[PDB]
């Protein structure tokens, strides 16, 4: 059978940095045409294994999920760099990862006068462990004064919105980005399409 492999790109909202819209299929049929259905790419290059030979690369997990990032910062999606999205929001595993695809969404997710539905988190505590959720949205205490459900000089909101005025230039755009994993390390395997 087939899988909703990249028809998920035909969706309204890719949540925020919090929820990754994790799909995590196990068995379907999918091939390179499902990747190549959509033309405009920004960061189609991938660090793990070159996409010129992605055919017959059958690995019994996808771990594939997507979100939205500002257009100023795209390069931090790479493994192991400095960046608030990649040190505080979500940091990629640095050993071996499947692929990444980036594209603009100025047409679809940039609304005039701002669209405050989107958001990104901020600094917390120690370094973010790679590939983990931080769905807690409670107010941040910097220290000492335990605070009480307010905002002040110590009570700090862990939330901040993109805004995304479409009048901004190449710096600020909705960039929809997806990441995938291709590892097997086990007994079973997924579909080997070209055969």
């Amino acid at each position, epitope marked *: 059978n087939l899988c909703p492999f990249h028809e998920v790109f035909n969706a309204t909202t890719f949540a925020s940095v919090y929820a990754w819209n994790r799909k995590r299929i196990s068995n379907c049929v999918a091939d390179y045409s499902v990747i190549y259905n959509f033309a405009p790419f920004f960061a189609f290059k991938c660090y793990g294994v070159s996409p010129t030979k992605l055919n017959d690369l059958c690995f019994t997990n996808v771990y594939a999920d997507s979100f939205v990032i500002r257009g100023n910062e795209v390069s931090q999606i790479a493994p192991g760099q400095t960046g608030n999205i990649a040190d505080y929001n979500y940091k990629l595993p640095d050993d071996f990862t499947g692929c990444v695809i980036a594209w603009n969404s100025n047409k679809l997710d940039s609304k005039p006068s701002g669209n405050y539905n989107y958001l990104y988190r901020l*600094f917390r505590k120690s370094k973010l462990k790679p590939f983990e959720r931080d769905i807690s949205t409670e107010i941040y205490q*910097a*220290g000492n004064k335990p605070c009480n459900g307010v905002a002040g000089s110590n009570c700090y909101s862990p939330l901040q919105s993109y805004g995304f005025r479409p009048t901004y230039g190449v710096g600020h755009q909705p960039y929809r980005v997806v990441v995938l994993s291709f590892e097997l390390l086990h007994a079973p395997a997924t579909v080997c399409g070209p055969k």
Partner: antibody
Amino acid sequence: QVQLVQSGAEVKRPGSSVKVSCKASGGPFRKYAISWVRQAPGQGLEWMGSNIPVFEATHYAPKFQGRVTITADDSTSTAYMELSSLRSEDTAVYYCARGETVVATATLDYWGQGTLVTVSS
Amino acid sequence: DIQMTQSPSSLSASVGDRVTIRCQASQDITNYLNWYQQKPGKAPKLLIFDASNLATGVPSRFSGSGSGTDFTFTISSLQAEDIATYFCQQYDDPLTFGGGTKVEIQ
């Protein structure tokens, strides 16, 4: 062990605006929280201004609300003070100050060398 | 935000004296107090943070308890270099300072 440096002394003409900087030496500049304070020659310490990576940049004294504004730059690791109008009590010397709190503006221990900012005819 | 006051603003002491300073702390806090050095003509410095435990490597003669509304701090010995101005600052109102003390060597 990290120290802190800034600009020199200015004897700029009163009835105008002034600018001064503060340059960090090490550590993650952005996620820290810089502070600022004035010492009057005849009086004590008076508070204004902070910058934070969550970007409020607005925790000011009500005595100086609408008068001072931080315009710090994270890329150059430099904090910037302006002043709306130069007045007699603006003859105080200035200080940018640093602490080991990871994000809090609460406790401060490191300081700059001071800046002599006086205005006169 | 608070009319923070210092009790008193100037002190008189001889060498090695058992001296003690009180800063008033009208707003009720829970050890939200720090003390501060200022030698005249140089940068400031801190002695005790959270009004409970010593900072860096200053000698242990500088001690204070506080813990509530009343907040006090002692030196108990004034030999060579302790003669300067002292401050205490407040957390609850974000950043405000005490009136400052002027101890003198007699």
